[PDB]
C-alpha cells in the first residue's frame, strides 16, 4: 500500500521523498547559516521543533 513515488511532508502529500536542506555553520560565530534558497537566514531550534 505504500506509494513509492508519492510521499508526505509534515503537512500534506508531496512528490519529494526527502527535503534534505543543507545548513552551513559559521566558524568564528556559533550561528549556522542556510545553504539553500534561504541563503543566509539564521537557523533556529523551535519549541520542541527539530530546527
Amino acid at each position: 500500500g505504500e506509494l513509492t513515488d508519492i510521499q508526505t511532508f509534515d503537512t500534506s502529500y508531496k512528490i519529494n521523498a526527502d527535503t534534505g536542506e543543507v545548513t552551513v555553520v559559521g566558524d568564528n560565530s556559533a550561528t549556522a547559516g542556510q545553504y539553500a534558497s534561504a541563503d543566509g537566514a539564521k537557523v533556529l531550534v523551535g519549541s520542541d521543533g527539530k530546527l
Partner: protein
Amino acid sequence: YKATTTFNAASAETVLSKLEDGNTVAVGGGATYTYDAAKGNFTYTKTVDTTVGADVTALANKIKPSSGTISGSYEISTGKSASFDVDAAGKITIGGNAAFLNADGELTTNDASGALTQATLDDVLTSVGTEANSSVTIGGTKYSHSAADELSYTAVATTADVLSAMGSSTAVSTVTLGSGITSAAVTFAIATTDSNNTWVDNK
C-alpha cells in the same frame, strides 16, 4: 422531460477561497508574475521586465524612476558581501568620500581608484547584478532590488524586488476579476492532488 442545466462556475472569487499553493497572472506574450497566499498575504515578486539583448540601459531606466530622486543611506550589496552605506545625489558617494566603481567583469564599488573608475549611479545600476553580478541587490530607503540573473549580453538579466505588496486576497480577487488579455492561473491544492485553473482575461 430532459432539462439540461448549465454549471458555468469556478470564477476567481470562489477558487481563491480554497488556496494555499502558488498563483500566477500573465498577459499575452508579456511578462508573467506569480503569487503565493501565505499567512493571508500573497508573496508577489515585482520582477522588472527583461526584454533586452545588449541594450542594458532599459532595465536601468526602468528601475531608476522607482527611486528617481536625490536620497541617502542607500544600501549597495554587490559582489557577495558588499553591504555599503551610500549617498546618492545623482552621483554615487559614500559618507565623506567619492566611491568610484571599477573591476569590470567583477564590478565592485571601487572607492579606491584603479585607473578605470566611473563613480556614477547609472553605471552602478547597470553594474549591480544587471550585467555581471549574481544574487546582489540595492537596499536602503526600504527596498531590495535583488538581481535574479546577470546579463552576459546573450542571456538576459532582471532586477527584482520582492515588495510583498498586493498581498491581500481581496485585492488579488479584484485585479484578477477584470484585466486586459491577462489569462491567469492558480494551483490551489496538494501538489500531489491538484491541477491548474485559468479564467477569461476580462472577468
